[PDB]
Amino acid sequence: NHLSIVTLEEAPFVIVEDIETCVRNTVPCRKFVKINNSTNEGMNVKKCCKGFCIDILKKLSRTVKFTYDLYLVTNGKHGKKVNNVWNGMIGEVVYQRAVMAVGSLTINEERSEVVDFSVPFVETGISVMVSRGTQVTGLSDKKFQRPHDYSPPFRFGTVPNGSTERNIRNNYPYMHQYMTKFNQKGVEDALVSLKTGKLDAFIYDAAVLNYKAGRDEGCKLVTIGSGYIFATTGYGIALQKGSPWKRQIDLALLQFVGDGEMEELETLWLTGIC
Amino acid sequence: RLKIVTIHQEPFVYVKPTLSDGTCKEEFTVNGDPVKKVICTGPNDTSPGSPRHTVPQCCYGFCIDLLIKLARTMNFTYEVHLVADGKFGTQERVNKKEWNGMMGELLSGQADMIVAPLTINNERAQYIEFSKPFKYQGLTILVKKGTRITGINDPRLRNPSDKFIYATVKQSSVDIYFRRQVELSTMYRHMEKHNYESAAEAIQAVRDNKLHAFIWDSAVLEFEASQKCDLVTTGELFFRSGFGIGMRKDSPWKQNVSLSILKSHENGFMEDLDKTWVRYQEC
Numbered sequence: 001n002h003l004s005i006v007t008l009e010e011a012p013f014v015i016v017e018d019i020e021t022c023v024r025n026t027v028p029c030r031k032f033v034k035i036n037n038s039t040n041e042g043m044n045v046k047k048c049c050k051g052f053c054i055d056i057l058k059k060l061s062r063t064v065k066f067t068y069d070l071y072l073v074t075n076g077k078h079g080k081k082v083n084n085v086w087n088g089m090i091g092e093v094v095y096q097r098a099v100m101a102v103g104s105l106t107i108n109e110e111r112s113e114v115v116d117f118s119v120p121f122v123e124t125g126i127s128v129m130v131s132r133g134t135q136v137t138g139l140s141d142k143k144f145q146r147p148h149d150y151s152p153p154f155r156f157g158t159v160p161n162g163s164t165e166r167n168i169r170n171n172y173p174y175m176h177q178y179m180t181k182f183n184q185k186g187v188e189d190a191l192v193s194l195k196t197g198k199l200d201a202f203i204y205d206a207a208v209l210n211y212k213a214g215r216d217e218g219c220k221l222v223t224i225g226s227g228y229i230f231a232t233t234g235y236g237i238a239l240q241k242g243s244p245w246k247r248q249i250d251l252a253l254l255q256f257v258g259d260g261e262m263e264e265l266e267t268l269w270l271t272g273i274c
Numbered sequence: 275r276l277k278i279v280t281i282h283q284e285p286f287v288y289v290k291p292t293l294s295d296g297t298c299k300e301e302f303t304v305n306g307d308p309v310k311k312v313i314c315t316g317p318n319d320t321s322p323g324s325p326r327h328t329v330p331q332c333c334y335g336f337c338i339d340l341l342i343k344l345a346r347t348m349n350f351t352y353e354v355h356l357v358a359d360g361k362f363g364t365q366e367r368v369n370k371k372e373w374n375g376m377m378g379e380l381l382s383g384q385a386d387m388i389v390a391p392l393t394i395n396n397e398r399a400q401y402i403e404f405s406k407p408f409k410y411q412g413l414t415i416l417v418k419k420g421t422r423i424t425g426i427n428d429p430r431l432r433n434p435s436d437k438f439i440y441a442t443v444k445q446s447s448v449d450i451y452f453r454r455q456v457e458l459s460t461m462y463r464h465m466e467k468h469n470y471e472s473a474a475e476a477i478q479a480v481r482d483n484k485l486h487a488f489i490w491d492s493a494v495l496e497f498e499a500s501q502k503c504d505l506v507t508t509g510e511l512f513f514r515s516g517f518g519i520g521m522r523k524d525s526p527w528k529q530n531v532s533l534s535i536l537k538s539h540e541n542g543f544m545e546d547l548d549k550t551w552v553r554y555q556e557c
């Protein structure tokens with residue numbers, strides 16, 4: 001009944017704050033912080049977590065009837081298979097350190113081979129962010145597919161090691177090898193790169209990009225098309241394969257959608273001024 | 275040999291008579307490729323409370339291409355039939371409760387898999403296994419071009435009278451949705467008097483000014499509006515929902531069906547089906 005749960009900061013899905021308890025719309029979440037780089041010693045710093053996925057976790061805890069010990073992943077991020085070993089939130093679940101992973105965790109085929117995912121609770125996929133008026137059709141645009149056909153070539157990148165880079169690597173080998181020189185360390189660096197003209201496009205998770213375009217100062221940065229999405233999928237709760245918790249978590253998430261509880265969370269956390 | 279149940283629902287499932295010889299007319303897609311067709315047995319005239327005469331018919335469309343892709347990927351053979359009562363499926367009180375439509379056929383063993391634009395919802399997920407969604411969509415409202423309705427919160431919907439008639443399809447996910455939400459009870463009581471046996475009959479009634487608004491799946495309604503310029507959709511999507519393949523909870527195919535759907539979204543196969551069947555025309 002008391003479950004180890006892993007998460008990862010990615011606003012507005014999971015936002016981390018300093019703690020001497022956690023109040024209001026926040027829940028306790030710990031983060032293992034190293035003492036130094038010449039030791040394995042670290043300490044579990046008490047922090048506070050809030051956001052769309054934290055609200056989902058609170059609703060599930062109440063409906064499905066479980067308590068939890070929420071922690072922030074420190075071995076990687078969302079999840080990548082490196083030399084056949086999963087790291088990130090996926091790895092925590094695979095290697096049974098967490099009963100479930102809650103956050104901005106994209107459902108894809110390779111992860112579904114090692115973890116069970118709940119039904120999708122946030123629609124996502126791959127979108128492209130550009131300055132308003134940039135002429136790009138989608139991922140199949142020749143500027144992306146055959147970048148050296150243009151002089152100067154289009155400058156575009158993603159945040160590596162997540163579901164978006166894995167999809168690009170598998171589908172568009174030339175685009176992928178071209179793009180790696182434009183890897184962005186994170187979403188905030190990518191938005192700065194777009195706004196200062198160092199990048200022409202940023203390819204990333206649709207739900208995060210729609211949230212960022214919604215809050216852009218001056219509403220200059222937009223997602224291409226009618227907020228077009230390639231490889232439509234969703235964020236899902238990752239559970240261990242054969243988890244006894246999946247059935248009731250799925251029914252609860254479906255109950256929240258059916259009762260309009262998800263639309264309320266979308267208004268509270270995702271919709272912006274733009 | 276899997277028994278597949280489906281339903282007429284353009285552009286997902288087109289249903290046409292066979293030729294005199296019992297085969298299907300050779301046709302080409304919008305992109306010049308041959309249309310893959312399957313024989314699907316089912317009742318002809320679907321008049322309520324009447325005997326059903328089963329005859330072979332021709333089925334094709336987005337869901338049939340998806341079925342063929344699933345069959346080749348997982349190496350299974352199948353036989354397709356149209357749901358006998360022509361409904362998607364709801365659980366109705368008879369203390370005892372029963373499932374009708376494709377839900378009833380899958381649970382009784384009349385079908386082994388539902389391959390149709392079947393909405394994933396709590397009510398059905400308690401009884402059957404749904405795949406990860408093969409299509410993400412939601413609900414919208416179809417009106418005759420010129421009819422001014424803001425959307426789901428329009429006073430002509432929220433404070434109804436017999437001057438403005440709106441409806442959905444009986445025994446569908448939309449019927450479930452409106453019956454479950456207490457806040458939608460005013461609308462549910464209006465629709466209950468006017469619900470249609472099938473989406474095609476409701477869409478025709480909007481064209482014929484017999485139904486003022488039809489509340490249904492955006493994947494279907496946006497297609498209809500893209501083909502018939504006298505028809506328009508109005509308002510933002512609500513009840514964002516997806517379609518999934520339906521199987522019994524003990525199905526040995528459940529994991530590989532979901533992996534195949536995820537693989538199809540990721541490699542562009544799902545977008546190829548959207549380009550072939552859903553998004554090729556504009557009004």
Ligand SMILES: N[C@@H](CCC(=O)O)C(=O)O
Nearest residue numbers: 078105106162163164205
């Ligand atoms: N949500 C993604 C991370 C961001 C991305 O790669 O688009 C994942 O689960 O890997």
